[PDB]
Amino acid sequence: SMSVKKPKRDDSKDLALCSMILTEMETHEDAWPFLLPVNLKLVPGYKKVIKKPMDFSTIREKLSSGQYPNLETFALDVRLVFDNCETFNEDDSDIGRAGHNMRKYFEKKWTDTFK
């Protein structure tokens, strides 16, 4: 509350560390469904169904330009990429399985880097 604060967690390295995690997600062999925005002209249904599209290149541009106020807003966009994938793709599909694999990969890196 006013003039009453928990001890200051060092967040000075968060930008660099999120960039590194994102690099590792970008270079994973199963990243290919997630590297670029889904083409809304060529994928029937996507625009109407997926209210907030998100992809690794869009996260990279937001990160690089100071559009994430903190490390949690960054994690919410990464998780959005996978929630969107689950919304549109059957579990038993190459893209469906890619999504599950990448979310697992992300969550471990996230825990190991920050928890």
In order of 71, 75, 86, the CA distances from 14 in angstroms are 7, 12, 28
- Give alpha helix (H) positions in the chain: 14-27, 46-49, 56-64, 71-88, 94-114
In angstroms, the CA 54 to CA 78 distance is 8
This structure's resolution (Å) is 1.9
Residue 12 CA to residue 50 CA, distance in Å, equals: 34
Contact (CB, 8 A) for 35 and 26: yes
Q: Dihedrals φ, ψ of 73, to 5°?
A: -65, -30
How far is the C-alpha of 108 from the C-alpha of 89, rounded, in Å?
23
1-115 CATH pick, 1.20.920.10, 3.10.310.30, 3.20.20.60, 1.10.3720.10: 1.20.920.10
